[PDB]
Amino acid sequence: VKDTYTDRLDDWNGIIAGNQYYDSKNDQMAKLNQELEGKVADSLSSISSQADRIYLWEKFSNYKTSANLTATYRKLEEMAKQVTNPSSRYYQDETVVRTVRDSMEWMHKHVYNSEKSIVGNWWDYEIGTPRAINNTLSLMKEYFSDEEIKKYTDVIEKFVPDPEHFRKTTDNPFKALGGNLVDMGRVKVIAGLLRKDDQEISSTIRSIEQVFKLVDQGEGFYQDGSYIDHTNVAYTGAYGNVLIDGLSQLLPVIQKTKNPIDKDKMQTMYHWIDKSFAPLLVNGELMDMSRGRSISRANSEGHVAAVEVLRGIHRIADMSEGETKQRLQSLVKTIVQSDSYYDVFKNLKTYKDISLMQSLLSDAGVASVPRTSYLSAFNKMDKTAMYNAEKGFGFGLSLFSSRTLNYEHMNKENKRGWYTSDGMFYLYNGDLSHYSDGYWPTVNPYKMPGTTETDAKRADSDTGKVLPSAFVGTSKLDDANATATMDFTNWNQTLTAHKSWFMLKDKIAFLGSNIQNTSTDTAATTIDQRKLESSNPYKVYVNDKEASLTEQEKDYPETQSVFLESSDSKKNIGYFFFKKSSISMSKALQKGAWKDINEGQSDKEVENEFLTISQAHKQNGDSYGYMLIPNVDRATFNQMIKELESSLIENNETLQSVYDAKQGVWGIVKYDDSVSTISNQFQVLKRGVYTIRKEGDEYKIAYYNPETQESAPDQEVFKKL
Template sequence: MATGTEKKHQEKLYIPKLKVNQLKLELFYEAGHGQVVFDNLSLREAGDKPSDDIKIASHYLEEQIVLPLNKHYLMEMADYHYQIAAESSNIVRVENGLLIPLAQGKTLLEVLDQEGQRVATVPVEILAAEDPQTTSLITKWCEVILGAENFDRSSPAMVALNQKLDDSVTKNLADLTKDQKSTYLWSDLADLHQSSHMTATCRRLEEMAKQVSSLASRYYQDKELIRLIKDKLAWLTLNYYHPQKDIEGKANWWDFEIGTPRAIVNTLAFIYPYVTQEEIKRYTKGISHFVPNPRQFRSTLVNPFKAIGGNLVDMGRVKIIEALLKHDKKALQDSIAALDTLFAFQPKGSRGEGFYEDGSYIDHTNVAYTGAYGNVLIDGLSQLVPLLQLLATSLDQQKLEVMTHWIEQAFLPLMVHGELMDMSRGRSISRENASSRQAALEALRGMLRLAEALPEQAKIRIKGKIKAVLAFHNQETILESLSSYYDMKLFKELLEDTTIQASPVKSYLSLFNQMDKLAYYNAEKDFAFALSMHSNKTLNFEAMNNENTRGWYTGDGMFYLYNSDLGHYSDRFWPTVNPLKMAGTTEAEVHREDVTIAYLKKLTNDYKEKAKEKAGMSTQQSSFVGAIKAGDKTALAVMDFQNWDRTVTAKKSWTILDDQIVFLGTAITSQTHQAVSTTIDQRKENPDNSYILFINGQETALTEEVLHRDDVTSLLLLSKDGQANIGYLFAKPTALALSRKVQSGCWSEINTNSNNKDLISQSFITISQTHSQASDSYAYTLLPNISKADFDKVCSEARIEVLRNDSKLQLIHDKKQGLLAVVKYNQAKEVVNGQLSLEKSGLYLYQKVGNDFKQLSFKALS
């Protein structure tokens, strides 16, 4: 064996799928350095092929019972009567088949059959109580993931949650198959070879275990339900989740290594007082096999990978709780130590997964995922933190500071008006029950738990910021979104704590350069602007598992404008928006295929490893993407854009100047001479606050019939209440196509896992500019939340000058602020404004001071 490692023995039952007379055994050692010795390899006949018949958990009369003082024991033989022998001392009590220890010592039980005949005498030994720390940690885990002890009958939300859980248990008990030979427990989860059905089955048992442990439940300490839970866990581990099982066919590694194990360990934690150590080891054999290493997934497959980010936290929720249940201190320490990598920022300029110091969060290799897998990370870690704090290995100051940084630099800047920006949520945007508002509450849930662990000053500061986001949700909605009494208690206490005031949100600019995103909030005008780009290091979009099938252009320079229309993105935007015309994007006007599993499979057959790229999921060849800022109201961003199939190119930039955002595009070219257009905007209308359109100052009717105008210098969408106005000012007369259309779609079109095929219809105003000539350009300014009077004034002032907009230079002059914003695309020397001599390619911001220009910010790009 290699130095420093331990011997490992594995025995596997090989069952040929077809008639086999030869086999080849290949040994793989792909990770690590040094020498590995494979020894004592043997093949031996195992006998007849194991029966495919379902195995039933058997019950045998106990020969003896050994139990610690803190546990209860449910007798094996439910039809027999157990009683304390006449000569026994006051060591135990027996209540309806449940043995309850009273003191340490030994005693005897008599076992009577249904006719009252004594069939056995069983020795009983009560040992000292288990390690109190282990027991308290398991209790704390149950408190964090449910918190039944926090139940308050005066809370409608808590009462409703308990009723919902009770009703679900009642229904699932009624629907449970009575057929002992059945291959499933519930008919709607009938194919347990499809691993998602296995996970869902285990979650139903977990739900039952929750109610068994909850004082408010009608099933509290229900011995028959406890027996059923244990029997069905045994059934699952005998038939579907055991070391001889392979992850193959319709099975997914996630279910075997995260979904099912989490449900099992949680179930055992809830019924911990009623399970023996022998039973725990039996029920967790599958976990030990499929998840042997707290730092690695797919260990039983040929392509294992390192556990990082949200998946690493999920691993921790499996391995840490498993170790506690099994009283395995070494495994506990190792599983906790495995989490250390979470608290290290990825190096600037690297391409690793995880958090970066600029607030970016990357997952799935190269996808911006703060609002999805980042949510999973802080949600899971925030559940583990209370346990870690009870251990000697509690979180040190550095780790607490890192968690504070995540909250304040990664998550809060992406929250506006109670929403979590969709550009950070990846394929989650296609889930009907996971709107941007719900995603925000999910993130806040983890943030509030983490805040409890922070030093007092940081705790109060962050709670004030959380309270500011919660102000956009009503208390009833907040509490109803929660699935534990523990979380309900935390949120209720915060909302009712008059000593913690909601922190006023000031203007801010967050540049997430490592994930090619930008978020800006203007406090005076109360709007937010978000920009979603991609580069050679980040993916344009991710479609996976039949989700986000039409996310094609969401990373191509799409912008989001958050104003007083709080439901613009959260209220069924994604199934009804035209996915070919995302706001701010420049694209070929071509048909696209929905990126489903079936479509990817077809492409895989044709293109192998290039399948995802052929489906449209790609990085750019260009690294000329990034942003700089000067203060909290001035920024410059650029994307030297090349579309997914390399047929459209454009040089796109955005300049934020306080309450105005300038959009420039140049060198727009189609390699295939297909029609190309830039979507100036595609705005969903609020039926209660619809828009009136003004073109060049004149009110203009807009219908479903496309309106073509070739002389547009200004557009104003004037909302009914005047609070959601949007102005567009063009640098020169521009030809535009405008329409107001009722667009229809359903959730199942963008997420085929959804059963909701109901057609949704919403009105959208679409404004686009067609690029019919080679190396075309566009130039316009977006003015959110501007009154009509102020817009008319801006139109006459011509405050912003576009001095250059070509393939070499994009140059903007803000005369009011004396600012110059420069995008330089090459290394050739350029003299700007007769004064500035620039050589390096990249982004420049200058402020005029007297007769000179002071450089405020620079970022080299190439």
């Protein structure tokens, strides 16, 4: 029956498929249509069509594996999209129409109905499958009766009757928030429209509104931009993605219902975009330290995942007006145009999304200016993101503490992410493909960049842990300078180290002290493990003399500097050791398969060449100290290390500090409340992290106590001499 409910479903169809916007003369759209044509043809040629079958598709035949239910229904959704596309060869095709109708009936009778119980992953029974069923019925509503539609959605109400909780039919339900809560909307708001149920629609929208609240504990968005999910995991880049991607799809529909959301919370969405998402996007890539276990998925590398966020932003811009709309469009435009590695259209899967992106890119009225420098201290999720616009590099610092889990290994995904938050760092430079093209299955998991660890074997079956200490955090002074520290203890309490970082605009100092090891295993810090490009080879210099690296590890005692020289200055990486250090280096081909780190991925072998730099710590009380200087040529690097000759102020068990004389900036980490006199100019008095700038006879101060998560009055922590 035609009514206001169907009017909303028509709008939903324009969003999830957009056939009304299709244009055969539009190159990008025709490409997506061709993809869907191929998928439907494959499904139609392989579908079991015998009497009393045991499965619709052999590839997804074991219905004990819940993933097979969702995969099956998604194949039907693809058919629905094409049968309703005037330009498809399957438009109104009699076999396709009957196949969808008959398939819904078969699954309903033998696989997914109200009499069944969750077997496998609850997600498929409550979100994945219901969304596929909803979209299929919505697109093909003119081929189903209202009675059939209610019949096929009854099961959804059985598994998801309450819009505030998930896993309601199990012995351990949970309160829905964040991304999952948004999916609750794509499940119950649409089912509500299909079932013409006003109560389901209103109550679900009511529950959804919880997503707009700022939290100070638990899952959700924090005032500093952090986003936590799964109790205590940094997750802006995966569950945050779902939240904005799904919410942006629902909003146009919700705002037209009799229960619209107060247009005051959109300001809150704009804040998420600027404070939480934007900082994590560098040259079109979404920082992996915010993506949790999704880093182990081959089809979801950094640039691909980024599109989920970008399309959410451009949809939100479309529902905005004036300046806000134009500025959001500009944000998307500049990020996309800065990405010379990935084609954004490869992950725009609906015609409306393709259309919106094309108009934005071709509209001269929408500004596309390189993004300016920034530095975000996401203390509530223990991550820090830095970007320098003048030199063009991004830096990511991945930590954890007593407040956050180090890594997520669940559903057989991310089996070797053990050290991805043990003070691991990321460098985003001219090689936009660095963390892509198979980086995750080929990187040596025992030597994540920046981490100090022993060489003990680790089990894939292990799961994440929190850190014993709360002394982990970042003190930010401005858009270019900040200081961080991590009171580190390894996974089995056999090694410790006071690790600190000094972000000084165009370089980052890495200091480590109090390194102790009580095990029989060898300890070392991985200075770097950089994935190489066969097209852009590096010329390696040690103490400014060319060195020839081999697969076999070579030792370089008394090293003052290491420089990786590319033909592109924006890919250069230099390391300056404040005090001559004993390191080792190697360049080797590393092989692996995505299945090695994620059970559901391909076992196909992947390979990449990596350059590894490390420093062994054979004695208790050992330390390390070096400056990472990216994006400058060889001569300039050599000049800079001369300028930085005496930049190291101290690096011991209670005090770590680096001074940038050119800027007049100090980075300081104090592990106790003793009076520390710095450069014979001032004194710092409390345990904590500092970033200070001297301007004339004035001092700008940024202090942070990571344990109490508080700053402090100036006179309590600083005193000029």
